[PDB]
C-alpha cells in the first residue's frame, strides 16, 4: 500500500492495492470422437498397383487424416519434401487430397521430384514448380520382385513433354520423322518398355512402390486427428471445447440442452454452460474465485499492523473472519460494538492489535 | 433414359399467404428465458409464397423452373408422402457440379455430383392390383456421371408408399441455405388436420445437416412421385399433395426463448410499427 | 557451385540477438542417438 500510494507514510484507512485471482492449471482440450477414418489402410498397402504411365487417381475428402502413424512407422525408406514438415502437419487442414500410386525402379526415385529433369520426369510423370504435398516411396522386394522375371510393369520411353498432373492412357506409336503408317519397322520403334525386375538386382534396380499425396487449397474437408485430453472438474481450468477457449471451473449443470446445441449463453452474451462432445455431458462454467485486496492499517504514525481483506472471495482455498463483504485476515473478531473507525462494509468496521 | 410427360393443363401460378412460418434457429447456442435479436436470412411474416398442387380430379403435375436467390423455404403438405427429393445447381446440363437429394423407398441419398439431368425428372410407384403392395419402380432423373465428388447413403428402412384417402395429415418443413461455402438443411415435421391451407401457429425449425460443399447454387427444382397400375407419358397419377416455396431475405428477428430452451415466439423488425 | 556458406535448416524458440553455433543433430520423433539416418537429418544446408 505504500507503493500504491506513492508515499512512505500511510494515513489510517482502507486502500485497495492489488487483485487476487486464482491462476488456471491443468489446461484441457476436448474434441469429438475420431470415428471418421476413410480407408487409408489399403490405399498405400494393397494387393497390386498399376503401371507408372497408368497411375491410379485416388480422391480423399471428409476424412480425419493422421500422418504421425505413417512417420513413426520407420518401415518406409523414402520420406523427404519441402513446403511441409513431418511435425505440425497434423494441425494443418486441407480441402482435398489427391493420391497417385505406382511402382518404379531404384534409380527412378531421384527423377521424381519438382525441378528435376529426366526421361521419366519428361515422358512419364512431372511435378509442378509450386507443388503442394510430396511423395513417399518404400521397398517392395518381397512383393513386386518375382523369381524368373516380372514384366507386368510398363513405362513410356519414346514420346514426342507432358503437362503437370496429366494422364496419357493412349500409347500410339511414335514417329521419328518415311512415315511408318502405324506399322512396326524402320523409324518407328516400340514407345514403351518393361522393367524385368529380378531378385538378383541390387538396390539400384530393386522395385519401389511409390505414392504421391498432393493437397490443394483455395471449404476444408479433411483435417488432422485433433487429439483430446482428460476432463477435470472443481478446479479453475483453461478449457478448449470445440475450438472455443475459456477460463473457469466446471460443475454439474441442471440445464437440459437441446440435441443440436453445444454451448449455452445467458443474458449479456457470455458462456454459461457447455456440452462436451465425447459423452454428451452438459457442464456449467463458472469463473474461479477472484476479487480485490484491501489493506487496513491504523496509520504508519500509529502502528505497522496490517489487515488484509479479500473482497467477495470465499478464501477457504488460498484470524480469518468471513462476512458477506468477503474475508478479513489479521484482525481478531470481537462480540462488542463500537463507533466505526475504518469502514470495511456490510455493517463491519475495523479499529485499532487490530480488531474487527 | 427419360421421356417428357404430356397431359398437363396450363394454369396460372398460385400464390398463398404464409402466416408466421419459416422461422429457424439462427445458431447452435442455448438460451433460456431471454429475448434475443439477430439479423439473418429469414422468411417474412404474413408473406406470399408460391403454392403448387397435385391432385387427380390435368392431374396437376407441377415441376416448373424455380430460381434460387438466397435460400429456400419448402413446406410439403401431404398424406402419402408424394414429394421425393430436391435438385440444386446452376446449369443442370452436366457442365457444372450439382446436388441431389432423393428419399426413395428404402434409403436417403445425398449426392454432390454431376448429372445429365432430364427436363422432367421424377419418381414412379407401381400399385399392383393382384396383390396390395406399393413399391417404387421408376426413377427418371439422371443419365450418367463421369466425375463425382460427394456420396452419402443413409441406412436402409421401410416406408408405406400407400395413398390414403381423406384430408392431409403431415407437414414437412425444410430450409435450405448456402453461405460461406456451407449448405445448411433445416427440417421439421408436424401433424395437421386440414384439407388445404398453410397451418398457423409457431414452429421452430431445428437444424438437421451442414454439408461442406462450396458450390454455387442459383437454380433448384423439386422431385415428386407418381402412381401407376395408358402410354409411357399418359397413364400416370400424381396423387394428392401440395407444397409451398418461399424466398428468404436478410431481416432482423426478435425471438423469445423459454426455460425449455426451444424457440417459443418470434417477431419481425420490419413488418409493422408494433413489431419494430 | 560455391558451398562455403551454410544455413540452419532443422531445429526445435530462438530469442532475438541469440547465437547458436552448436550444430547438434535434430530429432523430429525411435531416437537415432546422434547417428545419421531415419527420424533425424543434418540441420545445416548449403546455398550452392
Ligand atoms: C423433352 O423436351 C425437351 C425440349 O422440348 C427436349 O430437349 C431437346 O433435346 C434434343 C436432343 O436431346 C435437342 O436437340 C433439343 O435442342 C432440345 N430442346 C431444347 C429446347 O433445348 C428433350 O429431349 C425432351 N425429352 C425427351 C424427348 O425425352
Ligand atoms: C434406394 O437408393 C439406394 C441408394 O442407391 C439403393 O441402395 C443401393 O442399391 C443398389 C441396387 O440394389 C446396390 O447395388 C447398392 O449397393 C445400394 N447402396 C447401398 C445399399 O448403399 C436402394 O436399393 C434404393 N431402393 C430402391 C427400392 O430402389
Ligand atoms: C501399410 O500401410 C498402412 C497405411 O495406412 C499401414 O497402416 C500398414 O501398417 C502398412 N502395412 C505394412 C505391412 O507396411
Ligand atoms: C466417444 O467414444 C467413447 C469411447 O468409446 C464413448 O464412451 C462415447 O460414448 C463416444 N461418444 C460419442 C458421441 O460417440
Ligand atoms: C507520530 O507523529 C508525531 C508528530 O507528527 C511524532 O511526535 C510521533 O513520534 C510519531 N509517532 C511515532 C510512533 O513515531
Ligand atoms: C463458501 O463460503 C461459505 C460461507 O457461508 C462456506 O460455508 C463454504 O464452505 C465456502 N465454500 C467452500 C468451498 O469452502
Ligand atoms: C459473544 O457475545 C456475547 C454477547 O455480547 C458475549 O456475552 C460473549 O462473551 C461473546 N463471546 C466472545 C468469545 O466474544
Ligand atoms: C403475392 O405475391 C406478390 C409477389 O409475387 C406480392 O406482390 C403480393 O403483395 C402478394 N400478395 C397478394 C395478395 O398478391
Ligand atoms: C406382389 O407385389 C409385389 C410388389 O411388392 C410385386 O412385385 C409382385 O409381382 C406381386 N405378386 C404377383 C404374383 O404379382
Ligand atoms: C472431370 O475432371 C477432369 C479433371 O480436370 C476434367 O478435365 C473433366 O472435364 C471433368 N469432366 C469429365 C466429364 O471428365
Ligand atoms: C462460383 O462463382 C464465383 C464467381 O466469382 C467463381 O469465382 C467460383 O469459382 C464459382 N464456384 C464454382 C464451384 O463454380
Ligand atoms: C421443459 O419441458 C417440460 C415438458 O416436456 C416441462 O414439464 C418443463 O417444465 C420444462 N422446463 C424445464 C424442465 O425447466
Q: With an 8 Å Cβ cutoff, is A69 touching chain C?
A: no
Pairing verdict, β A307-311 and A326-329: antiparallel
**The C-alpha cell of A50 is what?**
498399376
What is d(CA B231, CA B128) in angstroms, rounded to the nearest whole number? 17
**The C-alpha cell of B65 is what?**
423452373
What is d(CA A86, CA A75) in angstroms, rounded to the nearest whole number? 15
What is d(CA B207, CA B180) in angstroms, rounded to the nearest whole number? 17
Contacts of A280 (CB under 8 A, 6+ apart): none
Is C11 buried (19+), middle (13-18) or exposed (0-12) by CB count in 10 A? exposed
Q: What is the DSSP letter of A193?
A: E
What is d(CA B53, CA B239) in angstroms, rounded to the nearest whole number? 10
**What distances in angstroms separate CA A294 from CA A2, A328, B229, one per listed residue?**
13, 9, 89
Measuring CA to CA, which residue among B90, B71, B74 is closest to residue B217? B90
What is d(CA A170, CA A162) in angstroms, rounded to the nearest whole number? 13
Query: Do residues B202 and B266 lie in contact, with contact meaning Cβ atoms separated by under 8 Å?
Result: yes
**The C-alpha cell of A317 is what?**
482455498
Q: Is the CB of B106 under 6 A from ligand 11?
A: no
Q: Sign of the C-alpha dihedral, residues A322, A327, A329, A335?
A: negative
Considering CB atoms only, which of B30, B182, B262 is closest to A219? B182
Q: What is the DSSP letter of A262?
A: -
Q: By three-state DSSP, how is residue A123 classified?
A: helix
H-type alpha helices, A21-118: 41-44, 68-72, 108-111
C-beta atoms surrounding A42 within 10 Å: 8
- Contact yes or no for A255 and B30 at CB 8 A: yes
Contacts of A245 (CB under 8 A, 6+ apart): A238, A239
C-beta atoms surrounding B77 within 10 Å: 27
What is d(CA B3, CA A166) in angstroms, rounded to the nearest whole number? 38
Element (H, E) at B225: strand B219-228
Query: Do residues B261 and B159 lie in contact, with contact meaning Cβ atoms separated by under 8 Å?
Result: no
Q: Technique behind this structure? A: cryo-EM
What is d(CA A250, CA A180) in angstroms, rounded to the nearest whole number? 82
The Å distance, Cα B216 to ligand 11 centre, comes to 6
Q: Resolution in angstroms for this experimental structure?
A: 2.9
How many residues are listed for chain B in this entry?
Answer: 276
Element (H, E) at A178: none
**The C-alpha cell of A298 is what?**
491504523
C-beta atoms surrounding A256 within 10 Å: 11
Edge-to-edge strand list for the sheet holding B29-30? A28-30, A236-241, A244-252, A281-286, A271-276, A263-265, B29-30
Q: By three-state DSSP, how is residue B226 classified?
A: strand
Residue in chain B closest to A96 (alpha carbons) equals B149
What is d(CA B90, CA B100) in angstroms, rounded to the nearest whole number? 13
**The C-alpha cell of A323 is what?**
462476512
Give the bridge partners for B13, in sequence order.
none
Measuring CA to CA, which residue among B105, B226, B103, B102 is closest to residue B158? B105
What is d(CA C28, CA A176) in angstroms, rounded to the nearest whole number? 51
Give the bridge partners for A57, in sequence order.
A100
Q: What is the DSSP letter of B46?
A: T
What is d(CA A257, CA B260) in angstroms, rounded to the nearest whole number? 8
**Domain B14-276: assigned CATH number:** 2.60.120.960
> Which chain B residues are Cβ-neighbours of A261 within 8 angstroms?
28-30, 261
Query: Do residues A321 and A333 lie in contact, with contact meaning Cβ atoms separated by under 8 Å?
Result: yes
Residues in chain B after which the backbone breaks (C–N beyond 2.5 Å): 57, 229
Q: What is the DSSP letter of A326?
A: E
Residue A292 CB-half CA count within 13 A: 9
Q: What is the DSSP letter of A110?
A: H
Query: Do residues A267 and A55 lie in contact, with contact meaning Cβ atoms separated by under 8 Å?
Result: no
What is d(CA A336, CA B225) in angstroms, rounded to the nearest whole number? 89
Contacts of B51 (CB under 8 A, 6+ apart): B14, B15, B16, B242, B243, B244
H-type alpha helices, A10-161: 41-44, 68-72, 108-111, 119-123, 141-144
Ligand 4 atom showing the smallest separation from residue A35 Cα:
14
**The C-alpha cell of B100 is what?**
441431389
The torsion defined by the Cα of B199, B85, B62 and B227, in degrees rounded to 10, comes to -100
H-type alpha helices, chain A: 2-5, 41-44, 68-72, 108-111, 119-123, 141-144
Residue carrying the nine cell digits 513431418: A86
Q: Is B248 left (phi over 0), alpha (psi -120 to 50) or beta?
A: beta
Task: Give the ligand whose atoms come closest to the C-alpha of residue A228.
Answer: 4
Residue carrying the nine cell digits 453461405: B179
- In b/e form, how buried is each residue of A46-57, taking b as 16+ CB within 10 angstroms? eeebebbbebee
Phi (first) and psi of residue A143, to 5 degrees:
-115, -55
Query: Do residues A348 and A323 lie in contact, with contact meaning Cβ atoms separated by under 8 Å?
Result: yes
- In b/e form, how buried is each residue of B168-207, taking b as 16+ CB within 10 angstroms? beebbbbbbbbeeeebbbbbbeeebeeeeebbeeebbbbb
Query: Do residues B188 and B173 lie in contact, with contact meaning Cβ atoms separated by under 8 Å?
Result: yes
- In b/e form, how buried is each residue of A307-335, taking b as 16+ CB within 10 angstroms? bbbbbebebeeeeebeeebbbbebbeeee
What is d(CA A77, CA A208) in angstroms, rounded to the nearest whole number? 9
Domain ranges of chain B: 14-276
Residue A241 CB-half CA count within 13 A: 26
**The C-alpha cell of B193 is what?**
388436420
Phi (first) and psi of residue A68, to 5 degrees:
-65, -40
Mutate to test the interface with B, among A265, A270, A283 (most CBs of B within 10 A): A265
Q: Sign of the C-alpha dihedral, residues B34, B39, B43, B46?
A: positive
Element (H, E) at B182: strand B182-194
Q: With an 8 Å Cβ cutoff, is C30 touching chain A?
A: yes
Query: Do residues B194 and B167 lie in contact, with contact meaning Cβ atoms separated by under 8 Å?
Result: yes
What is d(CA B263, CA B25) in angstroms, rounded to the nearest whole number? 8
Ligand 10 atom showing the smallest separation from residue B146 Cα:
13
What is d(CA A48, CA C31) in angstroms, rounded to the nearest whole number? 33
Q: What is the DSSP letter of A188?
A: B
Numbers of helices and strands, H then E, in chain A: 6, 20
H-type alpha helices, chain C: none
Amino acid at each position: 500500500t505504500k507503493c500504491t500510494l506513492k508515499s512512505f507514510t500511510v494515513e489510517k484507512g482502507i486502500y485497495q492495492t492489488s487483485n487476487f485471482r486464482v491462476q488456471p492449471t491443468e489446461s484441457i482440450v476436448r474434441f469429438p470422437n475420431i470415428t471418421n477414418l476413410c480407408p487409408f489402410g489399403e490405399v498405400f498397402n494393397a494387393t497390386r498397383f498399376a503401371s507408372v504411365y497408368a497411375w491410379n487417381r485416388k480422391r480423399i475428402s471428409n476424412c480425419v487424416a493422421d500422418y504421425s502413424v505413417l512417420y513413426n512407422s520407420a518401415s518406409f525408406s523414402t520420406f523427404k519434401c519441402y513446403g511441409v514438415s513431418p511435425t505440425k502437419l497434423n494441425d494443418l487442414c486441407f480441402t482435398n487430397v489427391y493420391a497417385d500410386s505406382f511402382v518404379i525402379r531404384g534409380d527412378e526415385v531421384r527423377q521424381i521430384a519438382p525441378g528435376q529433369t529426366g526421361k521419366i520426369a519428361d515422358y512419364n510423370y512431372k511435378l509442378p514448380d509450386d507443388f503442394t504435398g510430396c511423395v513417399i516411396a518404400w521397398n517392395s522386394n518381397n512383393l513386386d520382385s518375382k523369381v524368373g522375371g516380372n514384366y507386368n510393369y510398363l513405362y513410356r520411353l519414346f514420346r514426342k513433354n507432358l503437362k503437370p498432373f496429366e494422364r496419357d492412357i493412349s500409347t500410339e506409336i511414335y514417329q521419328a520423322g518415311t512415315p511408318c503408317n502405324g506399322v512396326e519397322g524402320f523409324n518407328c520403334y516400340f514407345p514403351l518398355q518393361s522393367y524385368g525386375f529380378q531378385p538378383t538386382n541390387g538396390v539400384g534396380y530393386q522395385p519401389y512402390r511409390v505414392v504421391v499425396l498432393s493437397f490443394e487449397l483455395l471449404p476444408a474437408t479433411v483435417c488432422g486427428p485433433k487429439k483430446s485430453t482428460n476432463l477435470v472438474k472443481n478446479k479453475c481450468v483453461n478449457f478448449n471445447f470445440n475450438g472455443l477457449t475459456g477460463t473457469g471451473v466446471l460443475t454439474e449443470s441442471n440445464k437440459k440442452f437441446l440435441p443440436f446445441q453445444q454451448f449455452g449463453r445467458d443474458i449479456a452474451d457470455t458462456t454459461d454452460a457447455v456440452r462436451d462432445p465425447q459423452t454428451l455431458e452438459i457442464l456449467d462454467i463458472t469463473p474461479c474465485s477472484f476479487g480485490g485486496v484491501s489493506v487496513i492499517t491504523p496509520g504508519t504514525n500509529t502502528s505497522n499492523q496490517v489487515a488484509v481483506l479479500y473482497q467477495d472471495v470465499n478464501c477457504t482455498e488460498v484470524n480469518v473472519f468471513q462476512t458477506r463483504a468477503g474475508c478479513l485476515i489479521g484482525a481478531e473478531h470481537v462480540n462488542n460494538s463500537y463507533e466505526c473507525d475504518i469502514p470495511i462494509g456490510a455493517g463491519i468496521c475495523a479499529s485499532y492489535s487490530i480488531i474487527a | 433414359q427419360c421421356v417428357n410427360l404430356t397431359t398437363r393443363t396450363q394454369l396460372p401460378p398460385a400464390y398463398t399467404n404464409s402466416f408466421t412460418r419459416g422461422v429457424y434457429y439462427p445458431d447452435k447456442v442455448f438460451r433460456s428465458s431471454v429475448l434475443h435479436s439477430t439479423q439473418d436470412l429469414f422468411l417474412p411474416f404474413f408473406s406470399n409464397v408460391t403454392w403448387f398442387h397435385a391432385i387427380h380430379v390435368t392431374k396437376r403435375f407441377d415441376n416448373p423452373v424455380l430460381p434460387f436467390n438466397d435460400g429456400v423455404y419448402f413446406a410439403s403438405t401431404e398424406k402419402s408422402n408424394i414429394i421425393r427429393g430436391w435438385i440444386f445447381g446452376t446449369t443442370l446440363d452436366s457442365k457444372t457440379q450439382s446436388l441431389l437429394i432423393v428419399n426413395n423407398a428404402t434409403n436417403v441419398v445425398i449426392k454432390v455430383c454431376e448429372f445429365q439431368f432430364c427436363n422432367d425428372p421424377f419418381l414412379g410407384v407401381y400399385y399392383h392390383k393382384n396383390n396390395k403392395s406399393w413399391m417404387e419402380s421408376e426413377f427418371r432423373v439422371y443419365s450418367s456421371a463421369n466425375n463425382c465428388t460427394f456420396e452419402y447413403v443413409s441406412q436402409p428402412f421401410l416406408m408405406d408408399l400407400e395413398g390414403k384417402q381423406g384430408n392431409f395429415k403431415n407437414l414437412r418443413e425444410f430450409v435450405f441455405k448456402n453461405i460461406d461455402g456451407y449448405f445448411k438443411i433445416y427440417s421439421k415435421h408436424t401433424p395437421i388436420n386440414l384439407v388445404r391451407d398453410l397451418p398457423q401457429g409457431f414452429s421452430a425449425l431445428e437444424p438437421l445437416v451442414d454439408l461442406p460443399i462450396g458450390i454455387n447454387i442459383t437454380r433448384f427444382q423439386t422431385l415428386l412421385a407418381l402412381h401407376r397400375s395408358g402410354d409411357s407419358s399418359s397413364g400416370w397419377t400424381a396423387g394428392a399433395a401440395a407444397y409451398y416455396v418461399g424466398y428468404l431475405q436478410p431481416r432482423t428477428f426478435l425471438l423469445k426463448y423459454n426455460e425449455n430452451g426451444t424457440i417459443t415466439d418470434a417477431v419481425d423488425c420490419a413488418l409493422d410499427p408494433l413489431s419494430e
